[PDB]
Amino acid sequence: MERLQPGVTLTESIITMGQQEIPSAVPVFIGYTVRYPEQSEASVRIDSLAEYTSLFGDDHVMMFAVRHYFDNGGQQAFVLPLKDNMPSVEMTTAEAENLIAALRSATVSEAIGGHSQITLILVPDMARLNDSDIVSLWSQGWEALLQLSQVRPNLFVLLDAPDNVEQAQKCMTTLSSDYRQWGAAYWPRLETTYQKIFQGTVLSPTAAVAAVIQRTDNDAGVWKAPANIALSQVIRPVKSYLQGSVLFNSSGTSLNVIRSFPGKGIRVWGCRTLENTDNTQWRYLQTRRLVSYVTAHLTQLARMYVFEPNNELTWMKLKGQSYNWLRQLWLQGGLYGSQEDEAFNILLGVNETMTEDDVRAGKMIMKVELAVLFPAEFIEISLVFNTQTEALS
């Protein structure tokens, strides 16, 4: 065991795993940390927990969400810490307002809106106010979060629901924000297998769902719904499944539930946004994430020829490059069409979308319409008897 002489000396330092860099699913964890030592940047990228514990301290509620995010299969994540003090063991009502006023602050809105790599946000610190908070305090936190997902194009928010069933139905009805389609609420708190197996630590569910959103993005694309996939380190939802059967409403606002199937694991059950279905098109989570995937990949094509002469030539180079990409997304099973004129359509001409003054003002107007798919959440068996039509051979 000579550590300076050349040879094979084993070390305790953990080096990083080879990252796969999934581009369209990467979360932030905005919460209170104990250390806060980073002095260069605003929001920093972590890769492992052993890199996080050296970089943001130990033994807090936001660490066990990162520790459970790296167990379910997530490989990269950002952490934007709140600069205020870490709260008590239970959250007082004088202190719980200090969190939601820090979520409306521009100190955390500029770090998210300036980085332009993050595609979904989440607070694991909202379940810290689940005890001794007092109902509208939850809705004051959700309306802060859904507003935070409006600073820039591709942002989503996974958010925690209150465990009490009366409090959940009230915060579903009395939300009343005009940006409800950017959120999704997963109801029960998970009892993970971390100490204090006998008293496993009760945990936010959204840290596990952000890893399986990233996990179903790796193989089946953004068009696949993130429900019905197993969760790794959890024992049980702390509330029963049958107690939360009133959380799903097919006509009102429906809240996603986490079910326990015997022999099949703990599973996410439901891919619904917060939505009141008056002919709405952004009803499911996968429809909102697909249509925001084709904005954030058509802006990367339309950025390439900003400051171009705006003649009839540079529209046919835009109508050709975006038609060729949407067909490439359609032939992956993404857009619900039997032929390409049924799946999508684009128009760009000087007499179709824009006027003669909009060319003089210097703007192109592209009109992309696209069809999407449905997730098959209900299945109905009919069971009819058919010796009527055997027809005597």
Binding site: W330, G334, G337, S338, Q339, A343, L373
Partner: protein, 223 residues
């Protein structure tokens, strides 16, 4: 009809014949061009000193054999999964399972292709032929042409219940207008392995008479 997207070949390995334990999957990079299914039956011709009738008896129906080829690639810019990862996944399906001391049971399936009235091709791998070409100068292979050869091993609890719907133990028959009991007991021989005699058909139904049935009545023919 509904959508337009490639269905791809998946080979699911099961540890048991019934399909209850799962051993791992492998989705193909590119689908095979062609799928060849080969059936075969053995017939032995009976020799006899007296007669010269040409009549060949049935010996055995050999199991089906599916033969498909695949290609794996890492040259192209679109694909980045290495071929060491996929060929390790493929050889672990044509492998002696340490739990059951046999090979594993594969289920090839893709799309709406029924493999003669099964959605999958249940069977085990009889052969496997990797042909590495076009290595990098790091000696990582960039093209691999596997040739799989399977032989059909289907579950027994599925084949137990196809025999019961083809030749059941009990039949119910609807009479129609002046077919005799001698004529109706010949129609039982279509699906009762030698029909019931016209007396033993009348005894089982409790017939008062050999012609004592109305044309609306339902008869029962058990064996």
């Amino acid at each position: 009809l509904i959508e337009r997207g490639l269905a791809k070949l998946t080979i699911n390995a099961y540890k048991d014949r019934e399909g209850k334990i799962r051993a791992g999957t492998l989705q193909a990079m590119y689908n095979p061009d062609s799928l060849q299914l080969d059936y075969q039956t053995d017939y032995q011709q009976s020799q006899a000193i007296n007669s010269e009738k040409q009549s060949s008896i049935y010996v055995q129906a050999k199991p089906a054999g599916l033969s498909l080829e695949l290609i794996f690639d890492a040259t192209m810019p679109g694909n980045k999964t290495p071929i060491e990862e996929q060929l390790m996944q493929l050889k672990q399906l044509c492998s002696v399972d340490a739990t059951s001391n046999e090979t594993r049971f594969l289920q090839v399936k893709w799309g709406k292709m029924r493999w003669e009235s099964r959605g999958y091709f249940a069977g085990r791998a009889k052969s496997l032929s990797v042909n590495y070409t076009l290595f990098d100068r790091d000696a990582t292979p960039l093209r691999v042409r596997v040739i799989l050869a399977l032989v059909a091993d289907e579950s027994l609890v599925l084949q137990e219940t196809e025999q019961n719907l083809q030749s059941p133990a009990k039949i119910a028959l609807r009479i129609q207008d002046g077919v005799s009991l001698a004529l109706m007991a010949a129609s039982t021989a279509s699906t009762l392995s030698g029909g019931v005699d016209y007396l033993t058909l009348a005894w089982q139904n409790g017939l008062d008479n050999l012609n004592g049935f109305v044309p609306g009545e339902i008869l029962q023919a058990t064996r």
